[PDB]
Structure formats: C-alpha cells, structure tokens
Write a protein that holds these residues in place. Structure first.
Motif, PDB file in Angstrom:
ATOM      1  N   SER A 178       5.434   4.411  12.341  1.00  0.00           N
ATOM      2  CA  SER A 178       6.068   3.045  12.104  1.00  0.00           C
ATOM      3  C   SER A 178       4.781   2.549  10.172  1.00  0.00           C
ATOM      4  O   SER A 178       3.439   3.028  10.315  1.00  0.00           O
ATOM      5  N   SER A 179       5.158   1.849  10.015  1.00  0.00           N
ATOM      6  CA  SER A 179       4.801   1.738   8.113  1.00  0.00           C
ATOM      7  C   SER A 179       4.459   0.006   7.713  1.00  0.00           C
ATOM      8  O   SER A 179       5.016  -0.255   8.473  1.00  0.00           O
ATOM      9  N   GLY A 180       3.269  -0.464   7.689  1.00  0.00           N
ATOM     10  CA  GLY A 180       3.275  -1.657   7.079  1.00  0.00           C
ATOM     11  C   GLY A 180       4.240  -2.057   5.946  1.00  0.00           C
ATOM     12  O   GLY A 180       4.926  -2.956   5.519  1.00  0.00           O
ATOM     13  N   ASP A 181       4.684  -1.017   4.915  1.00  0.00           N
ATOM     14  CA  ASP A 181       5.210  -1.351   4.272  1.00  0.00           C
ATOM     15  C   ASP A 181       5.985  -0.036   2.940  1.00  0.00           C
ATOM     16  O   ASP A 181       5.367   1.501   3.861  1.00  0.00           O
ATOM     17  N   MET A 182       6.234   0.273   1.866  1.00  0.00           N
ATOM     18  CA  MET A 182       6.531   1.116   1.414  1.00  0.00           C
ATOM     19  C   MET A 182       6.330   1.283   0.147  1.00  0.00           C
ATOM     20  O   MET A 182       5.665   0.699  -0.365  1.00  0.00           O
ATOM     21  N   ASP A 183       5.386   2.961  -0.059  1.00  0.00           N
ATOM     22  CA  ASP A 183       4.658   3.557  -1.616  1.00  0.00           C
ATOM     23  C   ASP A 183       5.006   4.495  -1.831  1.00  0.00           C
ATOM     24  O   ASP A 183       5.281   5.192  -1.448  1.00  0.00           O
ATOM     25  N   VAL A 184       5.442   4.466  -3.083  1.00  0.00           N
ATOM     26  CA  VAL A 184       6.332   4.915  -4.002  1.00  0.00           C
ATOM     27  C   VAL A 184       5.767   5.629  -5.199  1.00  0.00           C
ATOM     28  O   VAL A 184       4.546   4.667  -6.155  1.00  0.00           O
ATOM     29  N   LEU A 185       5.204   7.443  -5.204  1.00  0.00           N
ATOM     30  CA  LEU A 185       5.102   7.330  -6.345  1.00  0.00           C
ATOM     31  C   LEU A 185       5.916   8.030  -7.829  1.00  0.00           C
ATOM     32  O   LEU A 185       6.744   9.045  -6.985  1.00  0.00           O
ATOM     33  N   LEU A 186       5.736   8.079  -9.030  1.00  0.00           N
ATOM     34  CA  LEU A 186       6.968   7.862  -9.996  1.00  0.00           C
ATOM     35  C   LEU A 186       6.071   9.074 -10.824  1.00  0.00           C
ATOM     36  O   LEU A 186       5.003   8.345 -11.282  1.00  0.00           O
ATOM     37  N   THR A 187       6.581  10.005 -11.459  1.00  0.00           N
ATOM     38  CA  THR A 187       6.539  10.617 -12.132  1.00  0.00           C
ATOM     39  C   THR A 187       7.514  10.841 -13.478  1.00  0.00           C
ATOM     40  O   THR A 187       8.687  11.298 -12.869  1.00  0.00           O
ATOM     41  N   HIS A 188       7.166  11.090 -14.647  1.00  0.00           N
ATOM     42  CA  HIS A 188       7.578  11.063 -15.258  1.00  0.00           C
ATOM     43  C   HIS A 188       7.650  11.966 -16.293  1.00  0.00           C
ATOM     44  O   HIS A 188       6.381  12.192 -16.748  1.00  0.00           O
ATOM     45  N   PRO A 189       7.877  13.242 -17.029  1.00  0.00           N
ATOM     46  CA  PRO A 189       7.133  14.544 -18.140  1.00  0.00           C
ATOM     47  C   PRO A 189       7.538  13.743 -19.342  1.00  0.00           C
ATOM     48  O   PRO A 189       6.221  14.348 -20.087  1.00  0.00           O
ATOM     49  N   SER A 190       7.720  12.215 -19.107  1.00  0.00           N
ATOM     50  CA  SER A 190       7.896  11.966 -21.027  1.00  0.00           C
ATOM     51  C   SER A 190       5.933  10.737 -21.045  1.00  0.00           C
ATOM     52  O   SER A 190       6.009  10.363 -21.542  1.00  0.00           O
ATOM     53  N   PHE A 191       5.401  11.090 -19.734  1.00  0.00           N
ATOM     54  CA  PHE A 191       4.450   9.788 -19.561  1.00  0.00           C
ATOM     55  C   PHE A 191       3.395  11.093 -19.081  1.00  0.00           C
ATOM     56  O   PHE A 191       3.454  11.755 -17.446  1.00  0.00           O
ATOM     57  N   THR A 192       2.797  11.160 -19.989  1.00  0.00           N
ATOM     58  CA  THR A 192       1.252  12.350 -19.745  1.00  0.00           C
ATOM     59  C   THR A 192      -0.366  11.286 -19.560  1.00  0.00           C
ATOM     60  O   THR A 192      -0.189  10.684 -20.552  1.00  0.00           O
ATOM     61  N   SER A 193      -1.245  12.178 -19.580  1.00  0.00           N
ATOM     62  CA  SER A 193      -2.055  11.665 -20.305  1.00  0.00           C
ATOM     63  C   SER A 193      -2.062  11.777 -21.844  1.00  0.00           C
ATOM     64  O   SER A 193      -3.303  11.155 -22.198  1.00  0.00           O
ATOM     65  N   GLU A 194      -1.669  12.636 -22.473  1.00  0.00           N
ATOM     66  CA  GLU A 194      -1.498  13.033 -23.654  1.00  0.00           C
ATOM     67  C   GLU A 194      -0.787  11.945 -24.711  1.00  0.00           C
ATOM     68  O   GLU A 194      -0.760  11.998 -25.396  1.00  0.00           O
ATOM     69  N   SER A 195       0.670  11.419 -23.578  1.00  0.00           N
ATOM     70  CA  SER A 195       1.135  10.357 -24.558  1.00  0.00           C
ATOM     71  C   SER A 195       1.744  10.008 -23.891  1.00  0.00           C
ATOM     72  O   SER A 195       2.018  10.137 -23.255  1.00  0.00           O
ATOM     73  N   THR A 196       3.119   8.211 -24.547  1.00  0.00           N
ATOM     74  CA  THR A 196       3.348   8.571 -23.430  1.00  0.00           C
ATOM     75  C   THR A 196       5.171   8.396 -24.612  1.00  0.00           C
ATOM     76  O   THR A 196       4.849   7.001 -25.777  1.00  0.00           O
ATOM     77  N   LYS A 197       5.520   9.057 -24.679  1.00  0.00           N
ATOM     78  CA  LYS A 197       7.275   9.386 -25.544  1.00  0.00           C
ATOM     79  C   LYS A 197       8.353   8.767 -24.778  1.00  0.00           C
ATOM     80  O   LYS A 197       9.591   9.260 -25.766  1.00  0.00           O
ATOM     81  N   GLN A 198       7.698   7.892 -24.127  1.00  0.00           N
ATOM     82  CA  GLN A 198       8.416   6.833 -23.055  1.00  0.00           C
ATOM     83  C   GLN A 198       8.390   5.684 -22.961  1.00  0.00           C
ATOM     84  O   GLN A 198       7.860   5.132 -21.959  1.00  0.00           O
ATOM     85  N   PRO A 199       8.673   4.060 -23.357  1.00  0.00           N
ATOM     86  CA  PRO A 199       8.450   3.111 -23.038  1.00  0.00           C
ATOM     87  C   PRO A 199       9.864   2.794 -21.701  1.00  0.00           C
ATOM     88  O   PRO A 199      10.311   3.421 -21.910  1.00  0.00           O
ATOM     89  N   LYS A 200       9.004   1.566 -21.110  1.00  0.00           N
ATOM     90  CA  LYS A 200       9.706   1.113 -19.928  1.00  0.00           C
ATOM     91  C   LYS A 200      10.028   2.038 -19.006  1.00  0.00           C
ATOM     92  O   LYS A 200      10.705   2.388 -18.917  1.00  0.00           O
ATOM     93  N   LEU A 201       9.079   3.562 -19.074  1.00  0.00           N
ATOM     94  CA  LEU A 201       9.530   4.167 -18.098  1.00  0.00           C
ATOM     95  C   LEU A 201       9.541   3.589 -16.576  1.00  0.00           C
ATOM     96  O   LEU A 201      10.514   4.216 -15.237  1.00  0.00           O
ATOM     97  N   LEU A 202       8.581   2.511 -16.162  1.00  0.00           N
ATOM     98  CA  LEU A 202       8.805   1.756 -14.892  1.00  0.00           C
ATOM     99  C   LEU A 202      10.277   0.812 -14.802  1.00  0.00           C
ATOM    100  O   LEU A 202       9.713   0.776 -13.860  1.00  0.00           O
ATOM    101  N   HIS A 203      10.535   0.343 -16.315  1.00  0.00           N
ATOM    102  CA  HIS A 203      11.140  -0.721 -15.752  1.00  0.00           C
ATOM    103  C   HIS A 203      12.393  -0.094 -15.137  1.00  0.00           C
ATOM    104  O   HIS A 203      12.782  -1.177 -14.626  1.00  0.00           O
TER     105      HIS A 203
END
Ligand SMILES: Cc1cn([C@H]2C[C@H](O)[C@@H](COP(=O)(O)NP(=O)(O)OP(=O)(O)O)O2)c(=O)[nH]c1=O
Ligand SMILES: [Mn+2]
Ligand SMILES: [Mn+2]
Ligand code: NA
Ligand code: NA
Length: 326
Positions: A178-203
């Motif tokens: 059982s869990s207290g909540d849900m925790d979700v990690l999200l990754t997209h190839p357009s978002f790295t430490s080297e650039s953000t090729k796409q805005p609103k990725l989480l939006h």
DNA sequence: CCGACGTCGCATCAGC
DNA sequence: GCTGATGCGA
DNA sequence: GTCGG
C-alpha cells in the motif's frame, strides 16, 4: 513491528518537535532513531540495549525505559492534554498547512476541522484543496489501485508522445502493498541537461491527464514538478474511489538514474544516502553526484549509468528498491 | 564540548 | 517586474 | 537529540 510501541512514541515526539517546537533537527533526531529501531531485528528489552544503536543517545534511552516499564510516556501524555499543541498538531495534517501556518491559525482561534471550513477564505489554494480532500488523503492506496493508476498514467503518457517514458516510483517501486500516494518520474528525449528542445513538456502530460479526468486538482505546477490530485474512474452504480495525491517529476533524460534513485526513496534512506555521500566527500541530488574538492566546493558531475554506480561511488553495496525502506 | 545535521521545486512574501 | 528569504513539500 | 573529532 517488533518494536511498534517504541517507534510510535518516537514518531509522535518527532511530530511534536517539528510542528510545535519548530525544531527541525530534533524532529530528525527522533525520526532517525525511530528508523534504526524499526529495522532492529530484536524485541528491545531496555533503553541501554537501544542505546547501542546509532542515532539513539541518552535522552531517548531513558524514554524507552520509561515506556517499557509503564507502557507510556508522561512527556507525551502532557503534550496530548495541551490544547494548543493538540490543535497545532492537527492543523498540520492538512496538506499545505505547516508548523507556521498552523500556529498562526490557532492564534486566530481557528483550530478545528469545522473552524477551517467556515474560514475557507483565509487559506491559500494549496491549503484549500488539502482541506477539500482531507479525509481522502488520510486513506492509504492499495497496490491493486496503484496498478490501475499505473497503466492509466503510462498509457495517457504514450498518447501524447510515444517517446515519453513514465516510471512510477516512491513506495510503489519499493514493492509496498500500500502507498500514501503516487509518485511519477517523467523523461523525454527533448529534455536533457544539455538543452530543452521542447517547452511545456510537463504541461502537455498534465493537460492530457486532466482531459481524461484523472488529474482533478493542482496544488503546485512548474516546468519540472507537478503536485496535485488524481482519481480512479469507477463503474456504474459503484461508489467513487477516494481522491489521491500525485507527484510528477520531469527530469532530464540523461540524468534518469540519479532521478529514479532520488524519487524511489525512502525519505529517510534518501536523507541517509546523501548524508553518507558527504562523509565520503560527494554531494548527491536528483540530477547528479558531484565530488567535493579540497575546498568543499562541488566539482563536475561524475558519469552514471545505473543506480548501482551511485552506490559504488559512496562505497555502499547495492540495495534493491524493496530493501531501501528505512 | 560543540558544530553540523540532504537537497531541491513551487508558492508567496518583503524589499527594491 | 526582479531577487532573496521563508514556508511547505518531494 | 545525537554524534564525530
Ligand atoms: C518526503 C520526502 C520524500 N523524498 C523522496 C523519497 C521518496 O520515496 C520520494 C517520494 O516522496 P513521498 O511519496 O512523500 N515518499 P514515498 O512514496 O516513499 O512514501 P508513501 O507511500 O507516499 O507514504 O521522494 C525525499 O527525498 N525527502 C523527503 O523528505
Ligand atoms: Mn509516495
Ligand atoms: Mn509523493
Ligand atoms: Na547510540
Ligand atoms: Na500539512
């Protein structure tokens, strides 16, 4: 639950020191002690036996003796009988209300669940929603429901863009029943430490999860962290599922392993790993593990290709997610 | 004894 | 409006 | 509140 009574007492004292005394290190001292005792594989017979454990000192040893002798603790008994402490402790249970705001409210005479409901206009948005789903947020989430929430989130994510990878972390990844909540990690190839090729990725993901009426409310929202509410859909004639807290974290694709380590937990384990990292001469956050130089300033990020690499650096033997429940 | 106690994101406020 | 601190939370 | 140094 070998020493359930002991760890409960310490947890209650931690809560007091954090919510009432506003002494955060006291809070952590108690939480560390509770943690190390929780995984002690013997039914503790004395405070002296407990004193051997790292994190347990003299003062806690005495309380463990008092508890074992009489079955309770006078210090906690008094705290329970105090109106101000009891009221402040309660208000902090509403999400968005911390030690400061709770004390503020009690000063105005706002100190009950009923006091809050008639004073909705004096809460900020987070606190408003926390009050709204106060009952629902008290309830645990059975792993079965977590599994339903998983496929919904992961599939909705697939529909926005097939290159999104969504990983459920937290206690779920540790295999909790059982869990207290849900925790979700999200990754997209357009978002790295080297650039953000796409805005609103989480939006776009938030948006999509809202359109299918999974995400029902928002507590906070930025370019990398969503904090809000979600609900499973229910069949005809059946009562509704409780509303659930959900955290979503968009982390740069190349820094996945530091991210998935961080968000997996547990809370104390994460705190303990970073503490040990300092002792070893490193600093760890959700993005990187960086070495500390001769001066104390962090250097450049060290290469990471697994969760285990982070363990190797700070000279810890690797531990599966299900063994990180400190 | 006594300094140090993980590290960061978002909301909100003061101060300019 | 920005920056830095504070509150709350992961 | 506890602890390393
Ligand atoms: C609260 C907290 C969380 N975290 C990290 C580790 C947690 O596993 C992860 C998710 O936060 P959480 O959902 O508040 N903790 P959880 O998923 O392990 O526990 P639960 O089942 O929700 O109660 O974030 C910290 O690193 N420091 C913290 O103080
Ligand atoms: Mn969780
Ligand atoms: Mn969470
Ligand atoms: Na000890
Ligand atoms: Na709260």
């Amino acid at each position: 639950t070998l020493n359930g009574g002991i760890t409960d007492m310490l947890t209650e004292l931690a809560n007091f020191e954090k919510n009432v005394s506003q002494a955060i290190h006291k809070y952590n001292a108690y939480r560390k002690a509770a943690s190390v005792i929780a995984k002690y594989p013997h039914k503790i017979k004395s405070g002296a036996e407990a004193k051997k454990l790292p994190g347990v000192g003299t003062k806690i040893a005495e309380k463990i003796d008092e508890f074992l002798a009489t079955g309770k603790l006078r210090k906690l008994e008094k705290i329970r009988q105090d109106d101000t402490s009891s009221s402040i402790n309660f208000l902090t249970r509403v999400s968005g209300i911390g030690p400061s705001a709770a004390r503020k409210f009690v000063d105005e005479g706002i100190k009950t669940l009923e006091d809050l409901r008639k004073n909705e206009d004096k809460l900020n948005h987070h606190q408003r929603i926390g009050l709204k789903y106060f009952g629902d947020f008290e309830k645990r989430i059975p792993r079965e429901e977590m599994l339903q929430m998983q496929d919904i989130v992961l599939n909705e994510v697939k529909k926005v863009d097939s290159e999104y990878i969504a990983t459920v972390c937290g206690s779920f990844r540790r295999g909790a029943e059982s869990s207290g909540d849900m925790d979700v990690l999200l990754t997209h190839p357009s978002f790295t430490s080297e650039s953000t090729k796409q805005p609103k990725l989480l939006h776009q993901v938030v948006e999509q999860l809202q359109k299918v009426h999974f995400i029902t409310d928002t507590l906070s929202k930025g370019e990398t962290k969503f904090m809000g509410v979600c609900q499973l859909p229910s069949k005809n004639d059946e009562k509704e599922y409780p509303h659930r807290r959900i955290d979503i974290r968009l982390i740069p694709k190349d820094q996945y392993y530091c991210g998935v380590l961080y968000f997996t937990g547990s809370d104390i384990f994460a705190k303990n790993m970073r503490a040990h990292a300092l002792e070893k001469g490193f600093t760890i956050n959700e993005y990187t593990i960086r070495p500390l130089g001769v001066t104390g300033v962090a250097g450049e990020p060290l290469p990471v290709d697994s969760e285990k690499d982070i363990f190797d650096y700070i000279q810890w033997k690797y531990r599966e997610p299900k063994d990180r429940s400190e």
